[PDB]
Amino acid sequence: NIFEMLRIDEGLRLKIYKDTEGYYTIGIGHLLTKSPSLNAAKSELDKAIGRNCNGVITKDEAEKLFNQDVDAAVRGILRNAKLKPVYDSLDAVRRCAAINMVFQMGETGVAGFTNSLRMLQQKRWDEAAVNLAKSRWYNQTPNRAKRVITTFRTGTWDAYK
Numbered sequence: 251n252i253f254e255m256l257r258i259d260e261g262l263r264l265k266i267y268k269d270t271e272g273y274y275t276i277g278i279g280h281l282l283t284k285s286p287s288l289n290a291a292k293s294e295l296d297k298a299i300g301r302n303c304n305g306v307i308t309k310d311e312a313e314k315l316f317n318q319d320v321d322a323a324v325r326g327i328l329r330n331a332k333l334k335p336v337y338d339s340l341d342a343v344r345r346c347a348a349i350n351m352v353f354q355m356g357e358t359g360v361a362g363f364t365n366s367l368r369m370l371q372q373k374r375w376d377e378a379a380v381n382l383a384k385s386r387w388y389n390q391t392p393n394r395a396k397r398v399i400t401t402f403r404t405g406t407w408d409a410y411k
């Protein structure tokens with residue numbers, strides 16, 4: 251399911267870390283800030299958790315933030331007039347791949363995937379897979395992008411098994 255998929259892709263860390271882009275993050279891939287200030291990241295963390303955390307959270311707190319973040323990705327898709335029709339055309343496994351991309355890049359980070367979205371809506375899976383890989387996303391995180399792309403290409407969990 252989407253939670254297991256993203257837990258594999260994001261890992262779990264209970265202290266503030268830096269993501270693949272160098273940005274302060276915690277938990278299961280919860281972005282805190284793009285600011286270079288660790289203090290700014292710590293403030294965001296305390297606001298998110300509701301207590302003074304000192305840069306450290308519990309597993310329960312990480313899982314709670316993760317549920318909120320997955321839901322936010324889903325609701326962002328459903329509120330977006332370009333993403334929603336494609337999402338609604340997909341089967342459940344491919345919908346997980348869609349959520350995964352929005353979780354990683356946000357609605358703004360996927361804005362350039364217009365042609366990929368059309369190919370997905372047309373169910374041209376091999377063509378969509380080729381197009382999805384022609385991206386900064388694929389070049390910078392190729393193993394994760396390959397897993398997501400294989401999920402779109404096949405509609406199976408083969409890349410995560």
Ligand SMILES: CCCCc1cccnc1
Nearest residue numbers: 333337348351363366367
């Ligand atoms: C083109 C890839 C972006 C992920 C996605 C796919 C379908 C619907 N919403 C989001």
